């Protein structure tokens, strides 16, 4: 798996890849690994894939639930410690096999200025969280790649479009380096889904603009 | 035996005439909730799940009691199984035994009267369903309206008269409005909610301040 | 004690007799049990397994209650065992016995009267069987009909001279809305279910809409 | 059932008229605490978390046993989630069910008044919030001031044509001193305040020396 | 043991084969694996025989008591959640050599489109669930001879005689490559069992139909 | 142990063979595997001796207390799910070496065509259980001699005496190859035990007759 | 209701009558405890903690069942935190919200009444404190001194007209068995929260010392 | 990582590096490990970043929970006695892999002398604890270098400012010869955070403070 997000002036932006593996087999082309978990937030787990969407659908119901009960939403702050509980929850399954890292991106309403207000947190196997201050972060087995990917494009990410192009990118690298995170598949016409989330709250990307952006890409790499 | 249910039950009957107004009433585009409320925090409406809807009257601590179980009951079932196996229908039905169990068996029966309420889904066709539970745990399914709390009987009366199916909002909050006045004022003393059948998801959406006002 | 034990009594007899009513006969097709109810969603007759039904009268909460546990009762015994094991007698045996500890034991008596159903299995010949359940346990084995909920004797009487074995289906509703229009009917304020001992698995059917009116005319 | 309950009301009635006065009420530096109090060691106003306050009137041990279950709340879930989750409101809204379940069940109903305040945080523009919550769990937001305690007719008339919104520190004591007089020194009273100017944590005792500046100078 | 789904227009196919094993040594030749769960979905499992029937009892009894309790069929996701909590509190005995894993093929009442109603669902033994896409699948230690068999032959799946065909190839080449997939035994007369699922429901594909594709296949492959 | 069961023309007809070792010692030279559970179905273990024989105890109490709570007995499909229940039950004790596998034959009352009421269902130690289509089927340490034994004989069975004679067939080549199978024991007077099931019950076959299809085929043989 | 809690509270007031008398003093030296006690081995005043006397009136078992308690309360206090966060400010807090509950809930409501009091600690200067928790829980700052048990008035209002702070050790003695008169060494115990003591304030007065401070 | 904490005339400073790692992999560069419990004491953690955060959050609940229920804050032996009870509560955890020290600094608003009123209170996994009374100390995989570099640096604190000037320079000894401590970063911009406490309670150090004093060691190693 590869989860990337990073921030944009004025919001931020989530994109998964959508391959899963048992081994070096190829179980799955078309899994949806970035979920809007709420208004102004997307989750992206990796890992085992039931304990993934366990945690997206968990934490989904979590938030509601107390946004239904209080009559108002958690604060951001407390949206990592909820997640960051379940995280430290599962560490023992995690430890036998069953392990999932999330990586959660976010549109705090309560900022100050709206231009700065995304948020980006990591998440470690303990729980463990960190609001990550230098714009991207990613998540899985191509992180690495996708994290050296955006260390050199963050530069051209001056909106949202721009904000996606670079996180398709970042995937298309590390489906370059990682067998176990899949590449755009033309074939098929499967791309990676992506989330972004500005002011108006957060938004499935249309297929059509990931496969545009991708398309770009490969006829860029290519010549 | 049969004196202690007696006392219960006008306990309960008189709690519930000593206290403020609800009505619900469908409309063309879903749900309105319209209830007397001079406080700015408390409600007495709320959200259960993503197309149904709550209102209550009678003591708030214990309506709130029961709102909050009824939130638990519809996560905890969404999650179990899946978000659209959530029916108002359910959910009245687990507040009819939970207000059995209550009247029988609490120390003191819950002074309140519920409603619950479901739009369809978005994009489908299907008629607004409203359900009411009283204090003993007693089920009424509704078709236009629903009067809970103070004295009904005359509000009940007003609605008979000026309720038409289909009404646009507007003339639906009037018309609710009318026969609240006929019961016992503007929006510093209401509350007003609607369950949207046109909301893609969440269809519950309150309508305060300004937008009210515009009404 | 005795005096509980009468208040009881009354408070149950009083609780049912202020309920609507609700009429269940064999039919040459299986079992019909019709009951007054203007709800859409709130429903008073039910199914509790292949070939076993439920109907009740009196106050919804405790009868709904009662017919949750029974579905427990004969899904957890077929399980258990195998489907044929689950008979309409064995649910209402379960149903005398819950229904005695509930009269007895409970802040108050359940206002309800419940009938148990069973038709015979798909292919064979066997009579349907009638079960009724009062509000303190006791349990008659009845052969043709049983009536529940308000007043009893006008429908019990107008039934008992106009009710045949083996009727149609039309005929045997005719009979009872008849019956029970006496003692107190449209589509709009009619349940309507069938035990149809010609289904391969699943003999319970409800009757609704269209269907009815067409077998009401 | 109802004597019970009304004896509850009464018991609980009457033990709050006997004891002593409180008053809060909102100025322009955020909420006022005074409550008439002579003991050194004893105290009737409280913080709760870093903008919300309490005040109780009625009987110590009970409203103590509040506050400390006020305080386990909103550091409980301080933590849980953060600490910008606890607000006034939920704080009020506990209260309410809590004083609701020991009127109900309780050996003997709580003989107490509460008021849960909260000002704005740090900065921001935030009308300050006033709730009071009664011995049954009957719950009201009022805008301006609440009192508890003895006879509040007289107080709450004080103020119903002396208050005045945005008032001074000392204008704010003066007319809280000057309200409670119709129901007085710096060993009678206890004085504190929700400074909405405070970074982290709004509540301040107000005594001694300095209580008795605000008083006159 | 090998099972196999797939998506036909306007409904569904599942089968499977016969066999049973105590490692080399056949034990079953006449072994039922596929089951109507429902109304509209059958169940088809591989592993351990005891886990697989209690498995498929089980699901069924849960399934119908709902419908009975609440006076309405669980929703098709319902279903499959449902599924999968059951397999996934099967892992520690899973784990210890009890492993049994389904595959889920149901016919979706309430789908928009209702010629693309079929729905295949895959399970694992953690309680991972994946609704497939693609239009076909199998389970067992045949399902990857079967996949690649469908791979080649599914675009000739164009009613519910071509896709029954297709499943009954699928599972013939199963059986070819996998001796723990019973073939077709034309000297009992004992065949692959298959239930079709369309909007009139599931039923049972009678046996003599199952023959009669053997035979031809048969024919096809000796001349 | 070997322990045979099979369909014959209206019936089925179980039998067991006799021995009990420890390891490679012979203690018992009488035992009875084969118990009437109730008076149309037989069970036969193959196993420890002291699980079987609660297996078969508890089993045969089970069924009858349905019976007299219910009024009416299981039908063959409950049975069968509560001899697998109770297998698997024990399937811990079974992975520390107390394994007992049952072997069930019985007659439907409720079977469509009564002469082919008959029943033969196996299990295994993880409680599945397999109703047998292909007329015969055996349990033990024996069992795959007397099952190929049986493939082979199986044709001559055409009523009650002939399917007596091949299962007792059966269980000497099971005792011929598997030294924990008892053979008859012509010194001693001691032979397989059989029950014979039809529309009439459950019956203990007579040792004498037993005795006689015992010295035929032995005799058969030389 | 209102009348079974009076009855709770006229037992319990009638029970403390019945008593014998006790009184504490704050003199210059730390806090005085005179009680009026003719057993050989059975005390009404005691040590809680370091700087924390306990004093109390009424039925023994009840009285000495709370200091137990409140000895466990002030060493896993001091345990868990640090001995100098033990205060008698919060014993006394502890004391009033137990004897509310015992008073409320128990079969018989407790016939006691507790003094609690908190000397400096060594080398620091601050003014002793003097607490009364009642059967019904209720608390009460004290600057001077407090009576307990039996008739209390007449100590009371003699405590009021001979009381003089800094009294010395031999003169408030003196009007404390005065007050008290309103006594010798074989019918009184007495003991003294000393805060000149390093540690372990309380120190008691028996025989020889006693009636040597008794000329 | 490497906290440092020593004292003044009339206070205490605390200062901790702002590095996370992997392993070998960088995972932080700004990460504040050293926290203001209370107005008058901050906690500096070493070891699991998910314990070192959950230590430092509920101490400080802690702390102010008493203040509010008992109207009056914890004696210092108190705080000290807390947070000790607390480490011995991770112990199994540590054990497993989840370690994490905290190190203490304080200012006793209750001790006699106003000037020698700082503490410092270092712990081990066991939930051991000790008051240092020479001046300094360190936690985490750089303290040894730090504490040796304030062994021959300590002379030289005579206020606060030097005290500073001190604690910065023996995390920069740190992060000289550990990998594990992260030094000052001129590129990016980020410095050492610190707590000063002193009479007046503890506050944070403003970050302009530590990068002139930082850039102030940089130029004079050069
Ligand atoms: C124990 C154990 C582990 C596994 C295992 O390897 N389980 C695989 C998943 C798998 O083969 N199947 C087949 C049918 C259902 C299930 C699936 C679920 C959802 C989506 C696609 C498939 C896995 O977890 N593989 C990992 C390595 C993987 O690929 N993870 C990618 C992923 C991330 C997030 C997410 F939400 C879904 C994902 F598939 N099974 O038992
Ligand atoms: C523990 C443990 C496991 C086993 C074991 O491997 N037991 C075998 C099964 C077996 O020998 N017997 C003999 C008597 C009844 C039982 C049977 C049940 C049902 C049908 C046919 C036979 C198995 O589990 N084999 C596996 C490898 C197998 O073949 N599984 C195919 C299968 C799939 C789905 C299904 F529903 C039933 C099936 F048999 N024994 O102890
Ligand atoms: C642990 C452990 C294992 C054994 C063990 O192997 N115990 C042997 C049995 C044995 O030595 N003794 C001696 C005294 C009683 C007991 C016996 C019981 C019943 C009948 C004859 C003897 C066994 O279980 N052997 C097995 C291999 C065996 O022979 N099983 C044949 C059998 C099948 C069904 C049945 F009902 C009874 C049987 F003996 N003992 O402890
Ligand atoms: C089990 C297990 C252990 C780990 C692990 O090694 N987790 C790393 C931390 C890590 O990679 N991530 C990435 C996402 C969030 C989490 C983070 C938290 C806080 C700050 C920055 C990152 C760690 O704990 N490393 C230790 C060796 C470390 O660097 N500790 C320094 C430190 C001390 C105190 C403190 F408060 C925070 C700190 F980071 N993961 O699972």
Sequence with gaps: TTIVALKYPGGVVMAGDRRSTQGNMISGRDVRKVYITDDYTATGIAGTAAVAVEFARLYAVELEHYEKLEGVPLTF?????????????????????????????????????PQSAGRIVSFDAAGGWNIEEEGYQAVGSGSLFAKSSMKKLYSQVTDGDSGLRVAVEALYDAADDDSATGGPDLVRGIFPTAVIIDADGAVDVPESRIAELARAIIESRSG | ???????????????????????????????????????????????????????????????????????????????????????????????????????????????????????????????????????????????????????????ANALKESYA???????????????????????????????????PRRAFRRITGSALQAL
């Design chain 1, 77 to 113: 702050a407390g949206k990592i410690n909820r997640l960051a509980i379940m995280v430290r929850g599962n560490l023992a399954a995690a430890m036998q096999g069953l392990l999932a890292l999330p990586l959660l991106a976010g549109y705090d309403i309560h900022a100050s200025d």
């Design chain 2, 165 to 199: 199916e289909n009404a646009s909002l507007t003339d639906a909050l009037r018309i609710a409005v009318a026969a609240l006045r006929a019961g016992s004022l503007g929006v510093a003393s209401l509350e007003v909610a609607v369950l949207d059948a046109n909301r």
């Design chain 2, 1 to 155: 035996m049969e004196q202690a249910m007696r006392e219960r039950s006008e306990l309960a009957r008189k709690g519930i005439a000593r206290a403020k107004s609800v009505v619900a009433l469908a409309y063309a585009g879903g749900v309105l909730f319209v209830a007397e409320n001079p406080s700015r925090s408390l409600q007495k409406i709320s959200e259960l799940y993503d197309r149904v809807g709550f209102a209550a009257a009678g003591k708030f601590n214990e309506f709130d009691n029961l709102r909050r179980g009824g939130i638990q009951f519809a996560d905890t079932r969404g999650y179990a199984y899946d978000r659209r196996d959530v029916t108002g229908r359910q959910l009245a039905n687990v507040y009819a035994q939970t207000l059995g169990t209550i009247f029988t068996e609490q120390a003191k029966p819950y002074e309140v009267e519920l409603c619950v309420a479901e739009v369809a889904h978005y994009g489908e066709t299907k008629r607004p369903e409203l359900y009411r539970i009283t204090y003993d745990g007693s089920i009424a399914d509704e078709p236009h309206f629903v009067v809970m709390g103070g004295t009904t009987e005359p509000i």
